[PDB]
Write a protein that binds this DNA or RNA. Structure first.
Lengths: 333, 305, 108, 333
RNA sequence: CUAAGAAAUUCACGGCGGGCUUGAUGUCCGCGUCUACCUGGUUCACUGCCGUGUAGGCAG
């Protein structure tokens, strides 16, 4: 058998665009009429601060470059001056049926894939991957820079079965670290819920609301937009923040990248912490790709060794390739 | 071609990150082929298992929110992108532009089979809601339940059942829940009428669909020549540029059990109109039909006026 | 493709206007006998290159990144569809939109 | 070993936007419902006062320009006619973890930089830098032109631990000069608090309120926005002042620039006084770069000598390099 | 079975310097608003008494 020419996995764990609002601490139970954090503009004047070339040391030329003022317009987002708590809310739906691709050219390859993932669920459940997903929901890893230096972060998760809430979870997101993976009875019950949603045994819907206690009037950090440059034109606004209906927001893919930061089995190290799961597992902040294909630990060769060659890898690498199956992708030649 | 026995209303569907481009000539609302593919996939997933068939879509678009921007020195607009992950050498990616948007739309679906016979209307509508709240519509996720607690349940409304005056009254009370948006219809006859009255000057057809849907500024005989409604370009469908191909003879097919063809995009004119302007609510249903002897894979909404 | 030799694409129209060399070099190269300006070897090489220029691929090849789509049939199964990017059509409407937006008549 | 291609430091010492309000002196302890200073518009007839080209110094042309003067609309902010004291309020968080960059390429470079900063902390604490930051908070240097010619300035600083005030400092901001760094018991306690915040040993949030006794109805100076174009479709508006909702305000980068005005070790002189810590430490009001790269005292050459070639500079320049690290920035190729 | 399937923009910043808008002025003539009505028809669920009682009744 060979790999299929087309292979396409729909993503599970679909998040919403996380919307921001603001209020005071100890009002967070009544945090439904909290007004949205809006995006404003302001003006910045800076100086010459980057590295200069060795041909451009030239102190008269540097003084000439200083005396031309450097001005930009910058999108900014702040809390109100009487509110010290940022409330970030998104919804997350778990679907199940993680093994079936959305497209496969080879029928025998997709049947071998289906029996492979069926045997994987038969050997053990999703409980390791589901426990790590519940960890990334437990600590507020989706608060990307809003969590850095926060006083107290607190996460509420509401499983909504019918039109009302079915269950609630209450977590202190600063007690649960970002490095190691603990075990807690509420966290394991939430892990059982996300595992049962991933197994096709139901359709799980969660509403996640995080309260960070930052400070009065402080700056929050929503997503930034992509503006490709109008090069032979006027100067542009050199920052643009994401907003949904005049409310500061984080992208859905940003929360999704924050959720799947579970990979602690990459061969380079283990003390730097978990990274996000992807084939040739590469983090954009470091600019360097762990799980290189010259070692046999990337997703593609592991999948080909498990399915085509029937070499089942180690159980943490089975967790890794199953997490890549939940993450999805367009795989092929 | 088939009058539906009853009508189901997918009430207020919120959609994030849906595709906006959907065509190599237009960028606005997605093509109605996506909605016909949605109702066919819903017929596959939950429609078959209830002795129900689904035929067409009516779409009204309660709200639109494109992820675009104006680049500060030009009257045009550019698309907002996302940062893809790095390559295997960790250098960078290849930027391929995609256009995302956010939608609020209702769906009007017709049914012909044993609708009220085997099952009641409420349980059918509720399980179709539960099925459609697990998939995606136009490349973007169906946004799940939020603090919109009011607009949840559907309304399976029998089309020909009851008195005819009572039929107009219940379709008016169904249109009462679809006033915020404006429905979309095909305008092939108005396209052909303007094409024949333009052909007195020159015999070209795509220049018509250019000149139908812009702001034509005629000089002093400074006025603006205008159409009475909201005329938009739409992808009219699919026309094959290659003959029929067997499942196995083309490499890298999606399935080696389904015949393939190479196709080109037919573009046409659509119309956004207020839903009170049409008296029979079964007029708005977008059907897709295949004429596989030639290339014509068409989506439209016949029986509309 | 990836051919940086655009001189052949220029020479396809360099003798195409007013001459049958740039128009008959792809097929029916009877004018290519004088179009080579030499013996049968250069004329045969020019005719072979002109025939290989606009030659169809024949054997079809889709891709994963080629937008394969199902279309339902009237009361039966499905058909697979791969749309091509209408490069000539978008170039035609790009020329029309440049003539509408720019140009001296539109400026006046 | 070489320097990394990308390297970015997030800023510690995040201030908020400073808001302005007005009131009477000796009611400043009850200065919670003080009404905000509003930005109004007024008309200004501009006289001719520029240098002439001397190809246009003919007397008839000068009188013809004087006969038809031009007119603008100008944003202005004053105190009320019954209030004589300006209150300026902001919040400032001290975070800690100043050595770790938020982006890097080389692992060896960031490890060498981390142990270099760790050895810097081990030789001496943050006590000098936090002492100078507490000095710039003690004198109200963040009142840029509002401090000039004030009768009396008083700064109230509140360390806010839970939602209530943990500690209160009271400073006579004109007694603490803008020139030299004295020694004071309460100032050293504030410096120890800021140093404990900078070392990661705590989460520091401060509320800084400044009262300046300027006079009845006098003009205050909020931050000033940027105007690109001007026409008759506007009011020929030529000056725009910054404003949060409905209040005259100061940009957060203005307060931040007045906070890090601590650099007294620049090689040109020291009788001028401290400047803000910048790479190639420059003053826009003077149009000149102190710490030119021709001398060996800019930030980049000092950092490359300290990290790559282990040439640890003098302890003053070590304070300068670590202050530039606390300031943050984009450092790289 | 949806031009389907997949995705982290981001780090840092001093916009302020200064100014006389002025002089002068007639708003004004004239005018038909009328005709005809049940609001309260229990929306006044009150006041006091016996009874330990809020349980239950009474009297106007």
């Amino acid at each position: 058998l060979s790999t299929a020419s087309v292979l396409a996995f729909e993503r599970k764990l679909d998040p919403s665009d996380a919307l921001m609002s603001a209020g005071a601490w100890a009002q967070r139970d009544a945090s439904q009429e909290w007004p949205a954090v809006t995006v404003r503009e302001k003006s910045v004047r800076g100086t010459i601060s980057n590295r200069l070339k060795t041909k451009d040391r030239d102190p008269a030329k540097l003084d000439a470059s200083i005396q031309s003022p450097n001005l930009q317009t910058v999108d900014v987002a702040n809390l109100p001056s009487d509110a010290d708590t940022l409330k970030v809310r998104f919804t997350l739906r778990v679907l199940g049926g993680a093994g079936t691709p959305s497209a496969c050219n080879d029928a025998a390859y997709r049947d071998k894939l289906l029996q492979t993932v069926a045997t994987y669920v038969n050997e053990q459940g999703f409980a390791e991957l589901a426990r790590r997903y519940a960890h990334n929901l437990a600590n507020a890893r989706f608060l990307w820079r809003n969590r850095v230096g926060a006083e107290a972060v607190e996460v509420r998760i509401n499983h909504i079965r019918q039109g009302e809430v079915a269950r609630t979870w209450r977590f202190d997101a600063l007690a649960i670290g970002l490095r190691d993976f603990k075990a807690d009875a509420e966290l394991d019950a939430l892990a059982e819920l996300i595992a049962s949603g991933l197994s096709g045994s139901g359709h799980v819907l969660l509403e996640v609301v995080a309260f960070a206690r930052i400070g009065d009037g402080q700056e929050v950090f929503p997503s930034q937009e992509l503006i490709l440059d109008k090069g032979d034109k006027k100067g542009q606004k050199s920052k643009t923040l994401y907003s949904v209906r005049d409310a500061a927001a984080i992208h859905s893919q940003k929360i999704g990248n924050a959720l799947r930061t579970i990979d602690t089995w990459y061969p380079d190290e283990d003390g730097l912490g978990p990274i996000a799961v992807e084939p040739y597992g590469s983090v954009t902040s470091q600019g360097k790709a762990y799980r290189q294909p010259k070692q046999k630990l990337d997703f593609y060769t592991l999948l080909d060794n498990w399915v085509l060659r029937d070499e089942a890898p180690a159980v943490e690498q089975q967790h890794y390739v199953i997490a890549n199956l939940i993450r999805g992708g367009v795989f092929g030649e | 071609v088939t009058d539906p026995e009853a009508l189901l209303l997918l009430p207020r569907l919120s959609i994030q990150n849906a595709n906006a481009i959907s065509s190599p000539l237009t960028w606005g609302f997605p093509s109605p082929g996506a909605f016909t593919g949605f109702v066919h996939a819903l017929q596959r997933r939950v429609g078959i298992s209830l002795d129900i068939e689904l035929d067409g879509v009516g779409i009204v678009c309660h709200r639109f929110e494109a992820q675009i921007s104006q680049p500060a020195g030009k009257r045009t607009k550019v698309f907002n992108l996302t940062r893809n992950p790095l390559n295997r050498d960790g250098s960078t990616a290849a930027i391929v532009e995609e256009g995302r948007a956010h939608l609020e739309v209702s769906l009007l679906l017709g049914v012909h089979g044993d609708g009220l016979d085997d099952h009641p209307a409420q349980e059918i509508a509720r399980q179709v809601q539960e099925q459609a709240g697990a998939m995606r519509l136009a490349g973007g996720s169906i946004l799940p339940w939020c603090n919109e607690r009011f607009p949840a349940p559907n309304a399976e409304l029998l089309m020909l059942g009851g008195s005819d005056e009572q039929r107009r009254k219940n379709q008016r009370r169904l249109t009462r829940r679809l006033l915020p948006g404006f429905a979309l219809v095909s305008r092939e006859a108005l396209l052909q009428q303007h094409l024949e009255t333009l052909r007195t000057t020159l015999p070209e057809a795509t220049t018509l669909d250019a000149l139908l849907d812009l702001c034509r500024i005629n000089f002093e005989p400074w006025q603006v020549r205008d159409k009475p409604g909201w005329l938009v370009p739409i992808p009219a469908g699919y026309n094959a540029l290659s003959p029929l191909y067997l499942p196995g003879e083309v490499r890298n097919a999606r399935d080696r059990e389904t015949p393939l063809r190479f196709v080109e995009n037919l573009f046409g004119l659509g119309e956004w109109l207020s839903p009170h302007r049409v008296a029979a609510l079964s007029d708005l249903l977008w059907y897709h039909h295949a004429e596989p002897d030639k290339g014509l894979y068409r989506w439209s909404t016949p029986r509309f006026v | 493709g990836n051919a940086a030799a655009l001189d052949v694409f220029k020479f396809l129209s360099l003798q195409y206007q007013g001459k049958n060399l740039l128009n008959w070099l792809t097929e029916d190269s009877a004018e290519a006998v004088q179009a080579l300006s030499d013996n049968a070897e250069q004329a045969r090489e020019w005719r072979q290159a002109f025939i290989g220029i606009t030659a169809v691929k024949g054997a079809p090849a889709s891709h994963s990144l080629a937008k394969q789509l199902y279309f339902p049939l009237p009361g039966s199964g499905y058909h697979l569809l791969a749309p091509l990017f209408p490069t000539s059509l978008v170039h035609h409407v790009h020329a029309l939109l440049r003539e509408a937006r720019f140009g001296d008549a539109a400026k006046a």
